[PDB]
Protein backbone atom coordinates (compact mmCIF):
# COMPACT_ATOMS: atom_id res chain seq x y z
CA UNK A 1 0.00 0.00 0.00
CA UNK A 2 1.27 3.48 -0.94
CA UNK A 3 2.80 5.46 1.95
CA UNK A 4 2.66 9.22 1.22
CA UNK A 5 5.25 10.11 3.89
CA UNK A 6 9.02 9.68 4.13
CA UNK A 7 11.84 10.73 6.46
CA UNK A 8 14.62 12.93 5.10
CA UNK A 9 16.47 13.19 8.41
CA UNK A 10 18.57 16.20 9.35
CA UNK A 11 18.28 18.49 12.37
CA UNK A 12 17.69 22.20 13.01
CA UNK A 13 18.30 24.66 15.84
CA UNK A 14 17.05 28.17 16.70
CA UNK A 15 18.46 30.51 19.38
CA UNK A 16 17.38 34.07 20.25
CA UNK A 17 19.67 36.78 21.65
CA UNK A 18 18.95 40.33 22.82
CA UNK A 19 19.13 42.14 19.46
CA UNK A 20 19.56 39.11 17.18
CA UNK A 21 18.44 35.56 16.40
CA UNK A 22 20.00 32.53 14.69
CA UNK A 23 18.43 29.62 12.82
CA UNK A 24 20.86 26.79 12.05
CA UNK A 25 20.49 23.47 10.24
CA UNK A 26 22.68 20.74 8.78
CA UNK A 27 22.84 20.37 4.99
CA UNK A 28 22.61 16.56 4.81
CA UNK A 29 19.55 14.96 3.16
CA UNK A 30 18.90 11.21 3.54
CA UNK A 31 16.53 8.31 2.90
CA UNK A 32 16.92 5.12 4.98
CA UNK A 33 20.70 4.45 5.11
CA UNK A 34 21.65 6.39 1.95
CA UNK A 35 22.80 9.98 1.45
CA UNK A 36 20.86 11.94 -1.17
CA UNK A 37 22.79 15.19 -0.89
CA UNK A 38 25.66 16.50 1.24
CA UNK A 39 24.54 20.09 0.55
CA UNK A 40 20.77 20.60 0.31
CA UNK A 41 19.80 23.75 2.25
CA UNK A 42 16.67 23.72 4.41
CA UNK A 43 16.93 27.09 6.18
CA UNK A 44 15.49 29.92 4.06
CA UNK A 45 15.26 33.71 4.04
CA UNK A 46 11.54 34.42 3.52
CA UNK A 47 11.72 38.24 3.44
CA UNK A 48 10.75 40.80 6.10
CA UNK A 49 13.70 39.63 8.25
CA UNK A 50 12.09 36.23 8.82
CA UNK A 51 14.08 33.01 8.45
CA UNK A 52 12.30 29.65 8.35
CA UNK A 53 12.97 25.92 8.37
CA UNK A 54 10.54 22.99 8.16
CA UNK A 55 12.39 19.77 9.00
CA UNK A 56 11.21 16.16 8.61
CA UNK A 57 9.60 15.04 5.36
CA UNK A 58 11.33 17.34 2.85
CA UNK A 59 8.50 17.41 0.27
CA UNK A 60 6.08 18.73 2.90
CA UNK A 61 8.85 21.02 4.19
CA UNK A 62 9.44 22.59 0.77
CA UNK A 63 5.69 22.92 0.15
CA UNK A 64 5.14 24.75 3.46
CA UNK A 65 8.06 27.17 2.98
CA UNK A 66 6.86 27.80 -0.57
CA UNK A 67 3.34 28.58 0.68
CA UNK A 68 4.60 30.87 3.47
CA UNK A 69 6.92 32.79 1.12
CA UNK A 70 3.86 33.23 -1.08
CA UNK A 71 1.83 34.33 1.97
CA UNK A 72 4.39 37.09 2.63
CA UNK A 73 4.12 38.24 -1.00
CA UNK A 74 0.31 38.57 -0.87
CA UNK A 75 0.44 40.23 2.56
CA UNK A 76 2.34 43.08 0.85
CA UNK A 77 -0.12 43.29 -2.05
CA UNK A 78 -3.19 43.34 0.22
CA UNK A 79 -1.86 45.63 2.99
CA UNK A 80 0.11 48.43 1.32
CA UNK A 81 3.60 46.85 1.57
CA UNK A 82 3.30 46.53 5.38
CA UNK A 83 6.09 44.58 7.07
CA UNK A 84 4.98 41.16 8.33
CA UNK A 85 5.94 40.98 12.01
CA UNK A 86 7.30 37.70 13.44
CA UNK A 87 4.22 37.22 15.66
CA UNK A 88 1.91 37.69 12.66
CA UNK A 89 3.96 35.25 10.58
CA UNK A 90 3.71 32.70 13.39
CA UNK A 91 -0.09 32.93 13.54
CA UNK A 92 -0.27 32.72 9.74
CA UNK A 93 1.87 29.55 9.74
CA UNK A 94 -0.47 27.97 12.33
CA UNK A 95 -3.38 28.32 9.88
CA UNK A 96 -1.27 26.88 7.05
CA UNK A 97 -0.43 23.84 9.17
CA UNK A 98 -3.88 23.35 10.75
CA UNK A 99 -5.47 23.65 7.28
CA UNK A 100 -4.12 20.13 6.71
CA UNK A 101 -5.07 18.85 10.19
CA UNK A 102 -6.45 15.60 8.70
CA UNK A 103 -3.55 15.03 6.28
CA UNK A 104 -0.68 16.81 8.06
CA UNK A 105 2.59 18.29 6.87
CA UNK A 106 5.10 15.88 8.46
CA UNK A 107 7.48 18.58 9.64
CA UNK A 108 8.70 20.37 12.74
CA UNK A 109 8.76 24.06 11.81
CA UNK A 110 10.92 26.77 13.37
CA UNK A 111 11.07 30.47 12.42
CA UNK A 112 13.37 33.19 13.71
CA UNK A 113 13.68 36.97 13.50
CA UNK A 114 13.11 40.12 15.53
CA UNK A 115 9.92 41.13 17.34
CA UNK A 116 8.40 44.63 17.07
CA UNK A 117 10.59 45.87 19.97
CA UNK A 118 13.74 44.81 18.06
CA UNK A 119 14.40 41.84 20.37
CA UNK A 120 15.37 38.35 19.19
CA UNK A 121 12.49 35.93 18.62
CA UNK A 122 12.20 32.21 17.91
CA UNK A 123 8.88 30.41 17.29
CA UNK A 124 8.44 26.63 17.06
CA UNK A 125 5.54 24.59 15.64
CA UNK A 126 4.24 21.05 15.82
CA UNK A 127 3.14 19.26 12.60
CA UNK A 128 -0.50 20.46 12.96
CA UNK A 129 0.00 24.10 14.03
CA UNK A 130 0.49 24.31 17.80
CA UNK A 131 3.04 27.09 18.37
CA UNK A 132 4.95 28.89 21.10
CA UNK A 133 7.65 31.56 21.43
CA UNK A 134 10.92 30.39 23.02
CA UNK A 135 14.50 31.53 23.63
CA UNK A 136 15.69 28.12 22.47
CA UNK A 137 14.56 25.19 20.31
CA UNK A 138 16.12 22.21 18.55
CA UNK A 139 14.13 20.25 15.97
CA UNK A 140 14.50 17.16 13.82
CA UNK A 141 16.27 13.82 14.13
CA UNK A 142 18.86 14.88 16.74
CA UNK A 143 16.55 17.19 18.74
CA UNK A 144 16.64 14.77 21.69
CA UNK A 145 20.47 14.98 21.77
CA UNK A 146 20.81 18.75 21.41
CA UNK A 147 17.86 20.13 23.41
CA UNK A 148 18.98 19.05 26.92
CA UNK A 149 22.40 20.60 26.21
CA UNK A 150 20.78 23.94 25.35
CA UNK A 151 18.61 23.86 28.50
CA UNK A 152 21.90 23.57 30.39
CA UNK A 153 23.96 26.17 28.49
CA UNK A 154 21.43 28.75 27.23
CA UNK A 155 18.79 28.76 30.00
CA UNK A 156 21.37 27.64 32.65
CA UNK A 157 19.30 24.78 34.09
CA UNK A 158 20.59 22.68 37.03
CA UNK A 159 23.44 25.16 37.56
CA UNK A 160 23.76 26.83 40.96
CA UNK A 161 26.08 29.50 42.34
CA UNK A 162 29.17 27.85 43.88
CA UNK A 163 29.22 27.88 47.69
CA UNK A 164 25.55 28.85 48.05
CA UNK A 165 24.34 25.38 49.16
CA UNK A 166 22.34 25.05 45.92
CA UNK A 167 20.25 27.95 47.25
CA UNK A 168 20.90 30.54 44.53
CA UNK A 169 20.71 29.75 40.83
CA UNK A 170 23.19 30.88 38.25
CA UNK A 171 21.44 33.96 36.85
CA UNK A 172 20.13 34.21 33.27
CA UNK A 173 21.81 36.61 30.88
CA UNK A 174 21.62 37.27 27.16
CA UNK A 175 24.40 35.66 25.13
CA UNK A 176 26.45 37.46 22.48
CA UNK A 177 26.31 36.36 18.83
CA UNK A 178 29.85 34.97 19.25
CA UNK A 179 28.82 32.81 22.24
CA UNK A 180 25.65 31.60 20.50
CA UNK A 181 27.53 30.45 17.37
CA UNK A 182 29.97 28.53 19.61
CA UNK A 183 27.02 26.65 21.15
CA UNK A 184 25.49 25.99 17.72
CA UNK A 185 28.77 24.61 16.33
CA UNK A 186 29.40 22.40 19.39
CA UNK A 187 25.77 21.21 19.38
CA UNK A 188 26.01 20.05 15.76
CA UNK A 189 29.46 18.43 16.03
CA UNK A 190 28.19 16.45 19.03
CA UNK A 191 25.01 15.47 17.14
CA UNK A 192 27.18 14.48 14.14
CA UNK A 193 29.18 12.10 16.34
CA UNK A 194 26.19 10.25 17.79
CA UNK A 195 23.50 10.49 15.09
CA UNK A 196 23.93 8.84 11.67
CA UNK A 197 21.44 11.15 9.87
CA UNK A 198 23.42 14.28 10.91
CA UNK A 199 26.63 15.53 9.25
CA UNK A 200 28.25 16.81 6.02
CA UNK A 201 27.75 20.56 6.57
CA UNK A 202 26.28 23.24 8.83
CA UNK A 203 24.58 26.40 7.56
CA UNK A 204 23.68 29.19 10.01
CA UNK A 205 21.45 32.17 9.18
CA UNK A 206 21.90 35.15 11.53
CA UNK A 207 19.21 37.85 11.74
CA UNK A 208 19.87 41.41 12.97
CA UNK A 209 18.28 44.81 12.21
CA UNK A 210 20.84 45.17 9.38
CA UNK A 211 19.55 42.04 7.58
CA UNK A 212 20.19 38.31 7.15
CA UNK A 213 23.80 37.04 7.15
CA UNK A 214 25.00 33.49 6.37
CA UNK A 215 27.81 31.33 7.77
CA UNK A 216 28.86 27.83 6.64
CA UNK A 217 30.97 25.19 8.41
CA UNK A 218 32.12 21.69 7.43
CA UNK A 219 30.90 18.67 9.40
CA UNK A 220 32.07 15.05 9.42
CA UNK A 221 30.96 13.21 6.28
CA UNK A 222 30.76 9.62 7.61
CA UNK B 1 -1.37 17.64 31.16
CA UNK B 2 -3.07 18.56 34.36
CA UNK B 3 -5.59 21.41 34.32
CA UNK B 4 -8.24 22.42 36.84
CA UNK B 5 -10.75 25.14 37.56
CA UNK B 6 -13.17 25.53 40.43
CA UNK B 7 -15.91 27.87 41.60
CA UNK B 8 -15.89 29.48 45.02
CA UNK B 9 -17.11 32.47 47.07
CA UNK B 10 -14.54 34.80 45.47
CA UNK B 11 -15.04 33.68 41.85
CA UNK B 12 -13.09 31.10 39.82
CA UNK B 13 -9.57 29.75 40.25
CA UNK B 14 -7.91 28.37 37.13
CA UNK B 15 -4.63 26.44 37.39
CA UNK B 16 -2.68 24.50 34.76
CA UNK B 17 0.72 22.87 34.24
CA UNK B 18 3.03 23.73 31.32
CA UNK B 19 4.39 20.43 29.96
CA UNK B 20 4.12 19.08 26.42
CA UNK B 21 5.10 15.51 25.56
CA UNK B 22 5.60 13.51 22.36
CA UNK B 23 5.49 9.96 23.73
CA UNK B 24 8.16 9.86 26.46
CA UNK B 25 10.03 12.82 24.93
CA UNK B 26 9.54 16.07 26.87
CA UNK B 27 8.93 18.55 24.04
CA UNK B 28 8.39 21.69 26.12
CA UNK B 29 8.22 22.93 29.72
CA UNK B 30 6.81 26.40 28.94
CA UNK B 31 3.49 25.84 27.12
CA UNK B 32 0.67 28.28 27.74
CA UNK B 33 -2.26 25.97 28.49
CA UNK B 34 -4.55 28.80 29.46
CA UNK B 35 -5.81 30.57 26.38
CA UNK B 36 -6.81 34.16 26.87
CA UNK B 37 -9.92 34.01 24.70
CA UNK B 38 -10.75 37.56 25.72
CA UNK B 39 -10.23 39.69 28.86
CA UNK B 40 -13.32 38.05 30.43
CA UNK B 41 -13.04 34.46 29.23
CA UNK B 42 -10.46 31.75 29.81
CA UNK B 43 -10.05 28.43 28.07
CA UNK B 44 -7.89 25.57 29.31
CA UNK B 45 -6.00 23.24 26.97
CA UNK B 46 -5.74 19.47 27.30
CA UNK B 47 -5.37 16.74 24.68
CA UNK B 48 -4.20 17.81 21.22
CA UNK B 49 -2.05 20.95 21.47
CA UNK B 50 -2.92 22.25 17.99
CA UNK B 51 -6.60 21.27 18.25
CA UNK B 52 -6.94 23.21 21.50
CA UNK B 53 -4.79 26.21 20.52
CA UNK B 54 -6.37 26.64 17.07
CA UNK B 55 -10.05 26.21 17.93
CA UNK B 56 -9.97 28.25 21.16
CA UNK B 57 -8.37 31.20 19.43
CA UNK B 58 -11.00 30.76 16.77
CA UNK B 59 -13.54 30.76 19.62
CA UNK B 60 -12.23 34.18 20.66
CA UNK B 61 -12.87 35.54 17.17
CA UNK B 62 -16.45 34.24 17.32
CA UNK B 63 -16.96 35.87 20.74
CA UNK B 64 -15.66 39.19 19.39
CA UNK B 65 -18.11 38.96 16.46
CA UNK B 66 -20.93 38.35 18.95
CA UNK B 67 -20.28 41.56 20.92
CA UNK B 68 -19.92 43.58 17.69
CA UNK B 69 -23.25 42.26 16.36
CA UNK B 70 -25.17 42.22 19.67
CA UNK B 71 -23.46 45.18 21.44
CA UNK B 72 -23.03 42.98 24.53
CA UNK B 73 -20.54 40.52 26.06
CA UNK B 74 -21.16 36.91 25.17
CA UNK B 75 -22.39 34.61 27.94
CA UNK B 76 -20.21 31.74 29.20
CA UNK B 77 -23.00 29.32 28.21
CA UNK B 78 -23.17 30.63 24.63
CA UNK B 79 -19.38 30.77 24.25
CA UNK B 80 -18.97 27.18 25.45
CA UNK B 81 -21.78 26.04 23.14
CA UNK B 82 -20.15 27.58 20.05
CA UNK B 83 -17.07 25.44 20.80
CA UNK B 84 -19.04 22.27 21.63
CA UNK B 85 -21.24 22.57 18.51
CA UNK B 86 -18.07 23.10 16.46
CA UNK B 87 -16.26 19.97 17.73
CA UNK B 88 -19.48 17.94 17.43
CA UNK B 89 -19.47 18.59 13.66
CA UNK B 90 -15.99 17.03 13.57
CA UNK B 91 -16.99 14.07 15.81
CA UNK B 92 -15.27 10.89 14.57
CA UNK B 93 -12.62 12.77 12.55
CA UNK B 94 -10.09 12.46 15.39
CA UNK B 95 -10.00 15.79 17.22
CA UNK B 96 -8.60 15.53 20.76
CA UNK B 97 -9.70 18.17 23.26
CA UNK B 98 -10.49 18.44 26.96
CA UNK B 99 -11.30 22.06 27.75
CA UNK B 100 -12.86 24.26 30.35
CA UNK B 101 -14.51 27.56 29.44
CA UNK B 102 -14.41 29.80 32.51
CA UNK B 103 -15.88 33.27 32.91
CA UNK B 104 -17.92 35.70 34.96
CA UNK B 105 -20.99 37.59 33.75
CA UNK B 106 -23.78 39.57 35.39
CA UNK B 107 -26.65 37.31 34.30
CA UNK B 108 -24.86 34.00 35.08
CA UNK B 109 -22.31 34.89 37.74
CA UNK B 110 -19.12 32.81 37.95
CA UNK B 111 -19.53 29.88 35.56
CA UNK B 112 -17.43 26.90 34.41
CA UNK B 113 -18.25 24.66 31.42
CA UNK B 114 -16.39 21.42 30.63
CA UNK B 115 -16.22 20.80 26.86
CA UNK B 116 -14.52 17.83 25.13
CA UNK B 117 -13.97 16.47 21.61
CA UNK B 118 -16.68 13.76 21.70
CA UNK B 119 -19.26 16.54 22.21
CA UNK B 120 -19.79 16.50 25.99
CA UNK B 121 -20.77 19.84 27.57
CA UNK B 122 -21.26 20.09 31.34
CA UNK B 123 -21.85 22.98 33.72
CA UNK B 124 -20.14 22.35 37.07
CA UNK B 125 -18.37 23.77 40.11
CA UNK B 126 -15.18 21.65 40.04
CA UNK B 127 -13.40 19.98 37.10
CA UNK B 128 -9.93 18.48 36.60
CA UNK B 129 -8.87 17.53 33.08
CA UNK B 130 -5.75 15.79 31.76
CA UNK B 131 -3.46 12.79 32.27
CA UNK B 132 -2.86 13.90 35.86
CA UNK B 133 -6.47 14.88 36.64
CA UNK B 134 -6.92 12.15 39.27
CA UNK B 135 -3.89 13.37 41.26
CA UNK B 136 -5.26 16.94 41.20
CA UNK B 137 -8.76 15.80 42.24
CA UNK B 138 -7.41 14.03 45.32
CA UNK B 139 -5.86 17.16 46.80
CA UNK B 140 -8.64 19.42 45.52
CA UNK B 141 -11.59 17.36 46.81
CA UNK B 142 -10.09 16.70 50.24
CA UNK B 143 -9.47 20.42 50.79
CA UNK B 144 -12.20 22.36 48.99
CA UNK B 145 -14.75 24.58 50.67
CA UNK B 146 -16.98 27.18 49.01
CA UNK B 147 -15.95 29.70 51.70
CA UNK B 148 -12.22 29.58 50.85
CA UNK B 149 -10.48 32.96 50.80
CA UNK B 150 -9.07 34.27 47.51
CA UNK B 151 -5.62 33.73 49.04
CA UNK B 152 -6.27 30.14 50.22
CA UNK B 153 -8.12 29.11 47.05
CA UNK B 154 -5.17 30.32 44.95
CA UNK B 155 -2.82 28.12 46.98
CA UNK B 156 -5.07 25.04 46.73
CA UNK B 157 -5.21 25.34 42.93
CA UNK B 158 -1.43 25.75 42.85
CA UNK B 159 -0.88 22.89 45.32
CA UNK B 160 -3.17 20.58 43.32
CA UNK B 161 -1.21 21.06 40.08
CA UNK B 162 2.03 20.47 42.02
CA UNK B 163 0.65 17.18 43.35
CA UNK B 164 -0.06 15.99 39.79
CA UNK B 165 3.20 17.41 38.38
CA UNK B 166 5.05 15.33 40.98
CA UNK B 167 3.25 12.00 40.44
CA UNK B 168 2.20 12.18 36.77
CA UNK B 169 5.19 11.72 34.45
CA UNK B 170 3.38 13.63 31.67
CA UNK B 171 2.65 16.68 33.88
CA UNK B 172 5.19 19.26 35.04
CA UNK B 173 7.22 22.33 34.10
CA UNK B 174 5.51 25.21 35.89
CA UNK B 175 2.15 26.28 37.31
CA UNK B 176 0.12 29.10 35.77
CA UNK B 177 -2.49 30.63 38.09
CA UNK B 178 -5.53 32.70 37.18
CA UNK B 179 -8.24 34.35 39.18
CA UNK B 180 -11.48 35.19 37.43
CA UNK B 181 -13.67 37.99 38.76
CA UNK B 182 -16.61 40.03 37.43
CA UNK B 183 -14.19 42.68 36.44
CA UNK B 184 -12.33 40.04 34.43
CA UNK B 185 -9.44 37.63 34.83
CA UNK B 186 -6.27 38.41 36.74
CA UNK B 187 -3.00 36.59 36.18
CA UNK B 188 -1.24 35.27 39.29
CA UNK B 189 2.15 34.37 37.88
CA UNK B 190 4.25 31.53 36.53
CA UNK B 191 5.54 29.20 39.26
CA UNK B 192 8.38 26.85 38.31
CA UNK B 193 7.95 23.38 39.86
CA UNK B 194 11.75 23.25 40.19
CA UNK B 195 11.68 25.82 43.02
CA UNK B 196 8.01 25.47 44.03
CA UNK B 197 8.34 21.83 45.14
CA UNK B 198 11.21 22.35 47.60
CA UNK B 199 9.58 25.56 48.85
CA UNK B 200 6.28 23.74 49.52
CA UNK B 201 8.04 20.67 51.00
CA UNK B 202 10.00 22.76 53.51
CA UNK B 203 7.21 25.18 54.48
CA UNK B 204 4.31 22.69 54.51
CA UNK B 205 6.15 19.58 55.75
CA UNK B 206 4.52 17.47 53.03
CA UNK B 207 6.20 15.20 50.44
CA UNK B 208 7.91 12.85 52.91
CA UNK B 209 8.16 10.10 50.27
CA UNK B 210 10.88 12.20 48.59
CA UNK B 211 14.50 12.11 49.79
CA UNK B 212 14.85 15.54 51.41
Amino acid sequence: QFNPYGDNGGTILGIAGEDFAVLAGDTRNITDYSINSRYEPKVFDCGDNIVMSANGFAADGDALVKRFKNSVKWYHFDHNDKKLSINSAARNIQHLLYGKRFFPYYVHTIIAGLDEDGKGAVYSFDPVGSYEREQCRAGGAAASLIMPFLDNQVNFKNQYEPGTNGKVKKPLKYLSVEEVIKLVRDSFTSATERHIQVGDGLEILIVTKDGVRKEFYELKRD
Amino acid sequence: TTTLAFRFQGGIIVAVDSRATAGNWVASQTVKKVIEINPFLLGTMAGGAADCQFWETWLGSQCRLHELREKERISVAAASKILSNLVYQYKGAGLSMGTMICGYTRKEGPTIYYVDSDGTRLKGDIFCVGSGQTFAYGVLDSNYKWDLSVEDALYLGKRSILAAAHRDAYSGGSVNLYHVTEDGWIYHGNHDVGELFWKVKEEEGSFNNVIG
Binding site: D126 | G48, A49
Partner: peptide, 4 residues
Amino acid sequence: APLX
Protein backbone atom coordinates in the same frame (compact mmCIF):
# COMPACT_ATOMS: atom_id res chain seq x y z
CA ALA C 1 2.04 16.52 17.56
CA PRO C 2 2.57 16.61 21.39
CA LEU C 3 -0.03 16.28 23.91
CA UNK C 4 -0.82 18.21 27.05
